[PDB]
Ligand SMILES: C[C@@]1(C(=O)O)N[C@H](C(=O)O)CS1
Ligand SMILES: N[C@@H](Cc1c[nH]c[nH+]1)C(=O)O
């Protein structure tokens with residue numbers, strides 16, 4: 001039983017602290033997880049307690065081994081977390097840990113002050129546990145506790161995994177897994193249709209009908225918590241508030257949702273899906289080309305002297321470049337000349353902030369039930385996913401207050417305050433809350449398509 005998977009968004013390093021792919025493909029696990037309904041659960045943890053607000057006491061399960069046969073102990077968890085914190089800003093900024101002590105299966109994690117979201121962020125896949133004493137490169141073949149061990153990695157191309165027979169939860173159902181990267185969603189579907197691959201993610205919405213028609217294949221949709229957007233580069237002085245507001249008004253969100261996503265998305269306002277009951281969304285921006293033209297006039301742009309925008313896009317999320325095309329067309333009516341640059345390695349490209357004005361983008365904005373992760377990583381300076389370097393001290397203050405706020409209703413309140421204040425800045429233009437669409441050979445069973453948009457393979461995934 002060999003499973004062939006095709007994924008977009010090629011990786012360089014596949015250290016767990018560099019990408020969620022090891023968790024996705026069943027190689028690694030974090031201390032906590034979210035379940036099918038998106039709620040935080042103990043995973044590797046047998047018990048935990050929080051005797052005060054600066055102390056987290058954890059007891060690990062006693063029956064868990066890494067794929068090399070080494071026991072999962074508190075010392076191994078300590079060294080893993082500490083290495084990940086040292087090696088990744090994302091991890092570091094999500095885990096304000098002041099000290100860790102360990103003995104046997106118990107560890108104690110301390111902070112300097114109350115950080116209510118610490119436990120939640122220990123379910124983050126970037127915090128997955130690996131063996132720091134493994135005598136192999138963690139960037140190529142990390143050793144985890146998951147059901148499938150990474151055996152070979154051809155960088156940016158292909159990952160080969162094998163059944164870890166002593167996997168703690170159950171004997172995994174597949175013999176091998178082969179993961180190959182393919183950025184073009186139409187190619188991913190062709191690969192599925194030709195049986196080159198068995199399981200693919202991020203199915204282009206215009207191929208959904210074809211896959212539904214095909215009795216050899218099946219489609220799963222899940223509304224979840226991913227948001228597409230137009231992301232602005234705030235380090236470029238020409239990307240003023242008026243320019244951001246103008247572009248916000250050239251977007252037709254209802255049209256994009258109806259016709260580009262073909263109803264597999266809802267028009268977006270804030271970063272966060274409006275399905276979440278406590279979120280107070282800002283008002284929906286409706287396309288207004290005349291308004292955009294007026295906003296650009298404030299900056300001196302005219303038909304004779306238009307604004308020039310370099311807009312980056314990428315194929316991985318198939319609808320993004322379709323949005324870019326209609327943005328380009330409509331923007332011309334508002335005296336903006338957009339040049340679209342499609343790139344193969346989007347994060348590699350955006351690292352050079354001299355090379356772009358704006359980019360199509362996609363965020364997992366609330367993977368573990370709380371808005372804090374997104375605010376800290378996306379809206380704070382040097383936040384790990386803040387590719388356009390948005391920062392506003394007034395927003396910072398509220399985020400900082402949020403981070404120490406224990407009462408949940410008060411967190412919801414401050415969060416809505418952050419949404420309201422930041423929305424005035426147009427940090428990004430959030431376009432759609434769009435479904436994750438996964439497709440597979442009908443023989444492939446028990447993979448995950450759940451709202452957090454991270455998990456896929458577990459020990460029950462199989463071929464029948
Ligand atoms: C910015 C981020 C995202 O899509 O939310 N990119 C990576 C991902 O898609 O997993 C890590 S988090
Ligand atoms: N954050 C973007 C780009 C990316 C590349 N790899 C992971 N993410 C997305 O999820 O589409």
Ligand code: NA
Pocket residue numbers: 347
């Ligand atoms: Na990224």
Ligand code: NI
Pocket residue numbers: 362363364
């Ligand atoms: Ni991403």
